[PDB]
Write a protein that binds this ligand. Structure first.
Ligand SMILES: O=C(Nc1ccc(Oc2ncccn2)cc1C(=O)O)c1ccc(Cl)cc1Cl
Ligand SMILES: O=C(Nc1ccc(Oc2ncccn2)cc1C(=O)O)c1ccc(Cl)cc1Cl
Ligand SMILES: *c1ccc([N+](=O)[O-])cc1C(=O)Nc1ccccc1
Ligand SMILES: *c1ccc([N+](=O)[O-])cc1C(=O)Nc1ccccc1
Lengths: 261, 256
């Protein structure tokens, strides 16, 4: 009955709020720029990067690397948050532990880039809890491996943000990503498949209710999962170019755990 | 109003049953209750464990005590989500500030676990794996220096707590009280968080008197037990970083 699926939506949207500080709704508020309750310092060249540390604090050496390093701890941080949100999906913690770990190992990137879109517009991305902004151009212009590491995310975000999803939608969508069943190494696909079937049932109703005039947003949404599986693959292989380019520069082990390609 | 308290009572009961798979009535039929319509595989020594791992379906597929500890970590993660779901049914819990909600859960979840662990225990040992198992108290004590003493003070508590002879309709209101505790560090608006508790304490108060007619002053006895929950949780939170001195994606699963 629709009555139940509305509850799973409200439930996930509540957990989504509690697991991620920077929601899409908050992100867009910062990004309009008409909302100046706090506006972001914009990094666009090396001289903004200088200032970008004067007054923006982050949790603390070529620029292109130290950017990446700070980009990397954010990744760790988002993995922590997704992990906290996953644990809230009804029945996730009831699944086999090997498969909990396997659903995370694989869904985390697809979620990371889904949510990165909330932080992006055609010109850049909010940094450091929104305190910052960093241009698509300043990113596209770092040292040669690093000068398009982050470019395709931007093209996906633009095409993905075209869906105009809000947070209540994302929360259900984020769930479906976690509970795929298509993941390699899964011990028990069918219980995963049953939760995901509920979650899709939840998504469909939500999308048709939250965006009434937007027909086949459910189908066009699900189809966006194609674009995701392809970002994830460009990323790992680009990341391997850096493990060889940068034998001196290390990689956070939690991230490493989720990269046995 | 007599009837409003009893109303919230049945609300909470109905919700606790739906949120908690293994209810105390259930647990007690299995346990010392000779309700041998089904029986749990029992773990009394090392030989029975490997037997039991092989028959029972543990959802966490490495030495003896460590494997037990992790399977314990797995159960608590599920319990948490049962507590969490249960909470959303407490009247007014959801109307709270979400930060406050997260705080009550954060600090209330251990006390609630060890409260409901009591329902799965007796002096001789404890039910495990949805009650498909029973792990004797002596086999648990018979674990390696870090691990044998982990579980003795819980068995300590359950015996005293179970002596109250509380049932699931009592534990319903009681755990609601525990959660809507307005003395948790960091809450932002303790008025509802205490307004509901004064409602909850009223309900529990009447409930105990009606279900336990001449258990004089059980309510008080049951509240002063709440000093024993805080005390254990403290000894438990302590005993979780003496083990981290011994012991990555699953580490982020179990961030305590
Ligand atoms: O830069 C990014 N993230 C961060 C990088 C550094 C950082 O700390 C920092 N900032 C500037 C310079 C050095 N370090 C914080 C973040 C963040 O997103 O939270 C980033 C975000 C999205 C995309 Cl698509 C690309 C990047 Cl390179
Ligand atoms: O056994 C307990 N928890 C579990 C530990 C392991 C486990 O899975 C398991 N069993 C045996 C060996 C290894 N792992 C399941 C449970 C459970 O409570 O459901 C337990 C329950 C109460 C108390 Cl006071 C102590 C423990 Cl150790
Ligand atoms: C940036 C640089 C390196 C990695 N990595 O090696 O995994 C990841 C990222 C990245 O995309 N970080 C991120 C995720 C989410 C939000 C902001 C930044
Ligand atoms: C067992 C081991 C570790 C923790 N911990 O990390 O805080 C907790 C527990 C525990 O008490 N598990 C449990 C809860 C509820 C029912 C059965 C078992």
């Amino acid at each position: 009955e629709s009555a139940d699926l509305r509850a799973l939506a409200k439930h996930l949207y509540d957990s989504y709020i509690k697991s991620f500080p920077l929601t899409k709704a908050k992100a867009r508020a910062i990004l309009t720029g008409k909302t100046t309750d706090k506006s972001p310092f914009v990094i666009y060249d090396m001289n903004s990067l200088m200032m970008g540390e004067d007054k923006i604090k982050f949790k603390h050496k070529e620029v292109a690397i130290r950017i990446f390093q700070g980009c990397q701890f954010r990744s760790v941080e988002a993995v922590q948050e997704i992990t906290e949100y996953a644990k809230s999906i009804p029945g996730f913690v009831n699944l086999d532990l090997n498969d909990q770990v396997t659903l995370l190992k694989y869904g985390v990137h697809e979620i990371i880039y889904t949510m990165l879109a909330s932080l992006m517009n055609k010109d850049g991305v909010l940094i450091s809890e929104g305190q910052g902004f960093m241009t698509r151009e300043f990113l596209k212009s770092l040292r040669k491996p690093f000068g398009d590491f982050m470019e395709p995310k931007f093209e996906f975000a633009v095409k993905f943000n075209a869906l105009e999803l809000d947070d209540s939608d994302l929360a259900i969508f984020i769930a479906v990503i976690i509970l795929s069943g298509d993941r390699p190494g899964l011990l028990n696909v069918k219980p995963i498949e049953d939760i995901q079937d509920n979650l899709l049932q939840a998504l469909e109703l939500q999308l048709k209710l939250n965006h009434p005039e937007s027909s086949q947003l459910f189908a066009k949404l699900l189809q966006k999962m194609t674009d995701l599986r392809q970002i994830v693959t460009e990323h790992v292989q680009l990341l391997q170019v850096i493990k060889k380019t940068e034998t001196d520069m290390s990689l956070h082990p939690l991230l490493q755990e989720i990269y046995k390609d």
